[PDB]
Every structure is written in C-alpha cells, then in structure tokens.
Amino acid sequence: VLSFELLNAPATVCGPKLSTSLVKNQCVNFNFNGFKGTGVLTDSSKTFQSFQQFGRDASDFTDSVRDPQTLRILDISPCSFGGVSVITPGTNTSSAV
Amino acid sequence: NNSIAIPTNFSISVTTEVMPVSMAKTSVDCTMYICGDSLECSNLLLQYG
C-alpha cells in the first residue's frame, strides 16, 4: 500500500521526464513537477519562502511558480489580454471593421 | 374663529438635492471566467453555448 501527498514542498519522488528549455513572453503550456497549465511565463520580482514552490491568487489560481532547476521565480499571465471591441457597419453595406 | 396670523418678513433659502443618474456599465466574458484558458474546458462549454 502506497500513500501520496501533494503539498507546497520540494518534490522527492518524481516520474521519469526530461526537462526542456525555458521560453518567456510567449503563449505556451508548461509542466512544473506535474502541474500542467497554460500561460505566459515572465521573470518575477516576488519573494517566496525557502521551501514553497508556487504562489496563489485570491481566487486560488496559481500565478507564480518556481522552476526546480534554476531555483528562481517565474510569473504566469493569461494568453488572452483584456477586452477587444469591433466596430462594424452593416454587412450588406461593407465588410471593413 | 376671528384670529389670523399674517407674516411681516421673509427669507430666501438655498437647499441641496442629490440624485443618482447612472451606474457603471459592465461587460462579462464567458470564457476566461468559466474555462481558465484551457483547451479541454473550451471543448465542453459549447454544449452550454
């Protein structure tokens, strides 16, 4: 019988996977010790503790995460940015917006 | 039954009255609130389209 637990602690038992390069300021999907999502990775100036891995927002949405190789801090932002409005005339008149 | 009060002077008063007119216009995007930029959730939201 094996028992697991997933906390905000450094990982000890990990599956076999090869790390890749780090891409910043682009819309990518990441994988940080099994935590898979999608966002824009940017360098961050926030300060964590000596053991914690990922920070959390007010809505329990992880926005900062520490890469386990560089041991630095990264920031996650959504790929979609803001609200975009389209101004158009009628389609029977023109198609320029 | 034979008494009346008639004023002899007056005054001018300026009073305030505050009433609201409009509130803040708000818009809501269904995506990026229900499905947090994930492709697996956006394939299921179409059934609630």
Ligand SMILES: *[C@@H]1O[C@H](CO)[C@@H](O[C@@H]2O[C@H](CO)[C@@H](O)[C@H](O)[C@H]2NC(C)=O)[C@H](O)[C@H]1NC(C)=O
């Ligand atoms: C009504 O009251 C006003 C004051 O609120 C009086 O005005 C005065 O009038 C006299 C002359 O009548 C002036 O010399 C004064 O300067 C005025 N002001 C004040 C503050 O005293 C007015 O006379 C009154 N009207 C009446 C009693 O018929």
Ligand SMILES: *[C@@H]1O[C@H](CO)[C@@H](O)[C@H](O)[C@H]1NC(C)=O
């Ligand atoms: C291995 O991990 C260390 C410690 O986090 C890190 O400095 C290093 O870049 C990693 N990679 C290699 C190839 O040594």
